[PDB]
């Protein structure tokens, strides 16, 4: 009946951006008023839709993408952006319709010795298409001679880990992202706002 937004935002564990997690929100009354008033969000940028006039807009399906990146990368979670996250981890299309929500999670995703559980993709032969997920760990061949599963000359490992130490500056501290995207088909609307 009531949309399970708690299970997305308040989840105990988030995923790495290279293996970002999608949850399907369907068949429920979507209360967006909390997010509107909530002062716990550092980024609440919506594209194609307004957050205020969201409690009178029905949608056929809503999807929630969640991952963890560092502050200096939250700006890349938007249409028309480039960078390591936008090119190799999570790409939004130019016609994206939805909201990008983010908040600082330094107290949770940082250990004093550095949290290394979160990864991100560093090398790829090509940019990601919109809403593409790459979880392969094949050795990135950057040059002439091939790689045989081992790193070496012009042979890299595609995944890298963040530092995430409590003393880091804001721009290097971990951030939790929730990307709500709305789809509207010529279909009955199961997700309505109220």
């Amino acid at each position, epitope marked *: 009946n009531l949309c399970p937004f708690g299970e997305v935002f308040n989840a105990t564990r988030f995923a790495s951006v290279y293996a970002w*997690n*999608r*949850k*399907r929100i*369907s*068949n429920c009354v979507a209360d967006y008023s909390v997010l509107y008033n909530s002062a716990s969000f550092s980024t609440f940028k919506c594209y194609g839709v307004s957050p205020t006039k969201l409690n009178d807009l029905c949608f056929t*399906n809503v*999807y929630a993408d969640s991952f963890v990146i560092r502050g200096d990368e939250v700006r890349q979670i938007a249409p028309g952006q480039t960078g390591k996250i936008a090119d190799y981890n999570y790409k939004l*299309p130019d*016609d994206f319709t939805g909201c990008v929500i983010a908040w600082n999670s330094n107290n949770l995703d940082s250990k004093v010795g550095g949290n290394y559980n979160y990864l991100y993709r560093l090398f790829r032969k090509s940019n*990601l*298409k*919109p*809403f*593409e*997920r790459d*979880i392969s760990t094949e050795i990135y061949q950057a040059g002439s001679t091939p790689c045989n599963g081992v790193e070496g000359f012009n042979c890299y490992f595609p995944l890298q880990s963040y530092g995430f130490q409590p003393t880091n500056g804001v721009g290097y501290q971990p951030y939790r992202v929730v990307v709500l*995207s709305f*789809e509207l*088909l*010529h*279909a*009955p609307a*199961t997700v309505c706002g109220k």
Partner: antibody, heavy 121, light 108 residues
Framework: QVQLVESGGGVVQPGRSLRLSCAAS????????MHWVRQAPGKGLEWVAV????????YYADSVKGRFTISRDNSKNTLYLQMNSLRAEDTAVYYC??????????????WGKGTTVTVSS | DIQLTQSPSSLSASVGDRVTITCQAS??????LNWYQQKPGKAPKLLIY???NLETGVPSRFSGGGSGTDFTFTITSLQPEDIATYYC?????????FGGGTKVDIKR
């Protein structure tokens, strides 16, 4: 009311070729990704192939690799599956399916009614 | 590829009984598990998406649970119109793979 109308299904002798067609309606077919799924008589479901929003990236199954080819024509809003050198194992009810937003080939939100392909002499 | 194993292959139960079948994954698939119902002749009907959630219209008698590698599908009160084969299907990676299926009978 997303509509998926399959066609091109019928009889075909072994070694010959066949071309199925799926005619999508009620959503921007150009943005979404497209699937092909079959089910042989008395057997379970088997995923065949998927295509991205622009037709650039295609992924198949080892049972059909190098023998099937998936394509699309976003102007005509139709999805194709060129089936070359069909064997009796290919006799099944083939469905097309709407995929994810763009390159999100992990959804099969809506299925067509399915056309039947019979590989017999 | 990701392999799914359903248990049992088939079962028979009385009307009103609680039916619970399992689906085990060869590796972690988060909660990307689908449960389909397929009556013979018809096409598969999706009942459970994202391991736990109910599709539009599906009665409340159906439920699902699990995450990672072990998943379950439960009918709280089995009805005569539940005679079908129930498949589990993961969508964590390509190729999309289905379970072996569970045929459901009605003890008589």
């Amino acid at each position: 009311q997303v509509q998926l109308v399959e066609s091109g299904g019928g009889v075909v002798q072994p070694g010959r070729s066949l071309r199925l067609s799926c005619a999508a309606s009620g959503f921007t077919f150009s943005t979404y990704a497209m699937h092909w799924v079959r089910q042989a008589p008395g057997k379970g479901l088997e995923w065949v192939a998927v295509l991205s929003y622009d037709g650039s990236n295609k992924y198949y199954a080892d049972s059909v690799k190098g023998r099937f080819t998936i394509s699309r024509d976003n102007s005509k809003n139709t999805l194709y599956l060129q089936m070359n050198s069909l064997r009796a194992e290919d006799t099944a009810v083939y469905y097309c399916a709407k995929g994810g937003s763009y390159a999100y080939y992990y959804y099969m939100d809506v299925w067509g009614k399915g056309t039947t392909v019979t590989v017999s002499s | 590829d990701i392999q799914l194993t359903q248990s049992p292959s088939s079962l028979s139960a009385s009307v009103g009984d609680r039916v619970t079948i399992t689906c085990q994954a060869s590796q972690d698939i988060s909660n990307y598990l689908n449960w389909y119902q397929q009556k013979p002749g018809k096409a598969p009907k999706l009942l459970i998406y994202d391991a736990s959630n109910l599709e539009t219209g599906v009665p409340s008698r159906f439920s699902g649970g699990g995450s990672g590698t072990d998943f379950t599908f439960t009918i709280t009160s089995l009805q005569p119109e539940d005679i079908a084969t129930y498949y589990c299907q993961q969508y964590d990676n390509l190729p999309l793979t289905f379970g072996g299926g569970t045929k459901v009978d009605i003890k008589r």
